[PDB]
Design a protein around this motif. Structure first.
Motif, mmCIF file in Angstrom:
data_model
loop_
_atom_site.group_PDB
_atom_site.id
_atom_site.type_symbol
_atom_site.label_atom_id
_atom_site.label_comp_id
_atom_site.label_asym_id
_atom_site.label_seq_id
_atom_site.Cartn_x
_atom_site.Cartn_y
_atom_site.Cartn_z
ATOM 1 N N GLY A 185 0.805 -1.250 -0.205
ATOM 2 C CA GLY A 185 0.047 -0.028 -0.046
ATOM 3 C C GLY A 185 0.787 1.407 -0.022
ATOM 4 O O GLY A 185 2.168 1.208 0.376
ATOM 5 N N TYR A 186 0.210 2.430 -0.345
ATOM 6 C CA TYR A 186 0.961 3.707 -0.383
ATOM 7 C C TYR A 186 0.904 4.179 1.118
ATOM 8 O O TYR A 186 -0.042 3.914 2.019
ATOM 9 C CB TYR A 186 0.444 4.897 -1.459
ATOM 10 C CG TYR A 186 0.641 4.133 -2.879
ATOM 11 C CD1 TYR A 186 1.776 4.464 -3.331
ATOM 12 C CD2 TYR A 186 -0.419 3.769 -3.433
ATOM 13 C CE1 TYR A 186 1.918 4.074 -4.525
ATOM 14 C CE2 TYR A 186 -0.031 3.158 -4.650
ATOM 15 C CZ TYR A 186 1.035 3.398 -5.289
ATOM 16 O OH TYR A 186 1.129 3.322 -6.745
ATOM 17 N N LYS A 187 2.068 4.980 1.409
ATOM 18 C CA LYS A 187 2.359 5.712 2.617
ATOM 19 C C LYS A 187 1.578 6.882 2.600
ATOM 20 O O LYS A 187 1.132 7.531 1.410
ATOM 21 C CB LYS A 187 3.693 5.871 3.044
ATOM 22 C CG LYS A 187 4.438 4.577 3.097
ATOM 23 C CD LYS A 187 6.089 4.995 3.219
ATOM 24 C CE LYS A 187 6.658 3.554 3.475
ATOM 25 N NZ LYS A 187 8.047 3.785 3.130
ATOM 26 N N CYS A 239 -10.316 -0.294 4.767
ATOM 27 C CA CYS A 239 -9.755 -0.324 3.527
ATOM 28 C C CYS A 239 -9.434 1.028 3.276
ATOM 29 O O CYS A 239 -10.191 2.136 3.201
ATOM 30 C CB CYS A 239 -11.113 -0.677 2.696
ATOM 31 S SG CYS A 239 -11.879 -2.294 3.235
ATOM 32 N N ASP A 240 -8.222 1.131 2.729
ATOM 33 C CA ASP A 240 -7.541 2.356 2.145
ATOM 34 C C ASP A 240 -7.309 3.612 3.123
ATOM 35 O O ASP A 240 -7.502 4.564 2.977
ATOM 36 C CB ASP A 240 -8.382 2.982 0.958
ATOM 37 C CG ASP A 240 -7.454 4.082 0.137
ATOM 38 O OD1 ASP A 240 -6.363 3.900 -0.095
ATOM 39 O OD2 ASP A 240 -8.238 4.910 -0.375
ATOM 40 N N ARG A 241 -7.131 2.917 4.286
ATOM 41 C CA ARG A 241 -7.035 4.111 5.458
ATOM 42 C C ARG A 241 -5.414 4.643 5.513
ATOM 43 O O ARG A 241 -4.376 3.859 5.256
ATOM 44 C CB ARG A 241 -7.290 3.412 6.882
ATOM 45 C CG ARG A 241 -8.663 3.133 7.002
ATOM 46 C CD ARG A 241 -8.739 2.747 8.520
ATOM 47 N NE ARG A 241 -10.220 2.177 8.875
ATOM 48 C CZ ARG A 241 -10.659 1.651 9.963
ATOM 49 N NH1 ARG A 241 -9.745 1.825 11.104
ATOM 50 N NH2 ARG A 241 -11.686 1.294 10.192
ATOM 51 N N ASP A 242 -5.411 6.011 5.669
ATOM 52 C CA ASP A 242 -4.054 6.446 6.020
ATOM 53 C C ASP A 242 -3.336 5.745 7.155
ATOM 54 O O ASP A 242 -3.612 5.724 8.278
ATOM 55 C CB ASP A 242 -4.152 7.902 6.159
ATOM 56 C CG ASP A 242 -4.296 8.807 5.092
ATOM 57 O OD1 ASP A 242 -4.308 8.268 3.822
ATOM 58 O OD2 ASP A 242 -4.276 10.100 4.966
ATOM 59 N N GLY A 243 -2.138 5.454 6.850
ATOM 60 C CA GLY A 243 -1.195 4.724 7.888
ATOM 61 C C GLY A 243 -1.437 3.147 8.185
ATOM 62 O O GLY A 243 -0.943 2.666 9.182
ATOM 63 N N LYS A 244 -2.444 2.732 7.370
ATOM 64 C CA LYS A 244 -2.708 1.217 7.378
ATOM 65 C C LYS A 244 -2.402 0.672 6.371
ATOM 66 O O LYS A 244 -2.278 1.393 5.120
ATOM 67 C CB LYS A 244 -4.343 0.857 7.812
ATOM 68 C CG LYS A 244 -4.463 1.600 9.111
ATOM 69 C CD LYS A 244 -3.943 0.989 10.281
ATOM 70 C CE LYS A 244 -4.105 1.563 11.565
ATOM 71 N NZ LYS A 244 -3.669 0.743 12.792
ATOM 72 N N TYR A 245 -2.074 -0.474 6.111
ATOM 73 C CA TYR A 245 -1.723 -1.396 4.813
ATOM 74 C C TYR A 245 -2.490 -2.669 4.709
ATOM 75 O O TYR A 245 -3.001 -3.151 5.858
ATOM 76 C CB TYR A 245 -0.341 -1.544 4.940
ATOM 77 C CG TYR A 245 0.582 -0.204 5.004
ATOM 78 C CD1 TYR A 245 0.802 0.497 3.807
ATOM 79 C CD2 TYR A 245 0.708 0.193 6.326
ATOM 80 C CE1 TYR A 245 1.670 1.744 3.947
ATOM 81 C CE2 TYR A 245 1.489 1.344 6.371
ATOM 82 C CZ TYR A 245 1.878 2.219 5.254
ATOM 83 O OH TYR A 245 2.351 3.440 5.421
HETATM 84 NA NA NA Z 1 -3.581 3.008 3.435
#
Ligand code: NA
Ligand SMILES: *[C@@H]1O[C@H](CO)[C@@H](O)[C@H](O)[C@H]1NC(C)=O
Lengths: 36, 252, 25
Positions: free
Chosen positions: B182-184, B224-230
């Motif tokens: 995932g993206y940071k 799903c697609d949370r900032d800072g989660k992967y």
């Molecule tokens: Na994320």
């Protein structure tokens, strides 16, 4: 034995087998080229 | 798949849809690895905390599909399962360690322009490609947002993340049988798997031989697609000797 | 350029359950 799997695995009929690239596979290839 | 796009026709011919017989519902993704063998996540078949415990006759698979719902005449193929094999050390009580299962089709499926197996990684392919920042591709019919179902198969490309960053991002114990992608937050781009994408493939295209390899299985994520989660993925290569044992012992 | 996953094999020989995390999927 399964080993490497299908001798033909991972070559898509509608892309690699026709020498056609999909819309985003270039993004993957570019990510596999290291920086300096 | 969140923040992806429609797959192209024929883009992921190993994609398999796991369909629950009764009541009818898309359960999970999966992948075709030979004319008889389908690879998925163990938690798609067995996860007692959510009352999931399916046998061979509870399920069917649909291969060659693009539309989530439309019957695709002369394109898709339905198949029955002869046997399910769940990793005997799959950890459903804790962290989904070894989240892998194989399903044997009762009849071999015919390959076509829309149905074709993905490769499993050899050791050199795995070493050359399983590097932080290198992107793989995730496909599925799962939800488009965390809180919304796609009309057709979705695709997203996502970079592998350094293991310490994966571990820092979560309270769960991360094992060597998992990786994250995932993206940071600072990278701008977005994208993730979501509910319904579980069991589908994370694939990478070898620049050495032009073949697509399945490096991961969609395993779990916090939202799903949370900032800072992967998103977390089963490390397919690390479990490949089990895959080959199952096919050596029970394949044909 | 850093390994994202170890190049070895799972062999024979604990924390929070996933289902307790809000929003887990
Ligand atoms: Na994320
Ligand atoms: C799954 O179901 C079978 C048959 O009902 C049962 O024997 C088995 O114990 C169940 N497995 C788990 C992990 O609950």
């Amino acid at each position: 034995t399964f080993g490497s799997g299908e001798a033909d695995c991972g070559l898509r009929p509608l892309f690699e087998k026709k020498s056609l690239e999909d819309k985003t596979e270039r993004e993957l290839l570019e990510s596999y080229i290291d920086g300096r | 798949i969140v923040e992806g796009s429609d797959a192209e026709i024929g883009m992921s011919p190993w994609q398999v849809m796991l369909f629950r017989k009764s009541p009818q519902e898309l359960l999970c993704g999966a992948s075709l690895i030979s004319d008889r063998w389908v690879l998925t996540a163990a938690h798609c078949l067995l996860y007692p905390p959510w009352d999931k415990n399916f046998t061979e006759n509870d399920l069917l698979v649909r291969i060659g599909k693009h539309s989530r719902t439309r019957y695709e005449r002369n394109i898709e193929k339905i198949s029955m399962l002869e046997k399910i094999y769940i990793h005997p050390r799959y950890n459903w009580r804790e962290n989904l360690d070894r989240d892998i299962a194989l399903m044997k089709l009762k009849k071999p499926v015919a390959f076509s322009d829309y149905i074709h197996p993905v490769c499993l990684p050899d050791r050199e392919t795995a070493a050359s490609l399983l590097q932080a920042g290198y992107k793989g591709r995730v496909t599925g019919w799962g939800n488009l947002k965390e809180t919304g179902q796609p009309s057709v198969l979705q695709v997203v490309n996502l970079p592998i993340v350094e293991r310490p960053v994966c571990k820092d991002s979560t309270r769960i114990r991360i094992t060597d049988n998992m990786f994250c992608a995932g993206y940071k937050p600072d990278e701008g781009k977005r994208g993730d798997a979501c509910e319904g994408d579980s069991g589908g493939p994370f694939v990478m295209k070898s620049p050495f031989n032009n073949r697509w390899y399945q490096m991961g299985i969609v395993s779990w994520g916090e939202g799903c697609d949370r900032d800072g989660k992967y998103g977390f993925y089963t490390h397919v290569f690390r479990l490949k000797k089990w895959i080959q044992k199952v096919i050596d012992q029970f394949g044909e | 350029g850093e390994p994202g996953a170890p190049i070895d094999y799972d062999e024979y020989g604990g924390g929070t359950p996933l289902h307790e995390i809000p929003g887990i999927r």
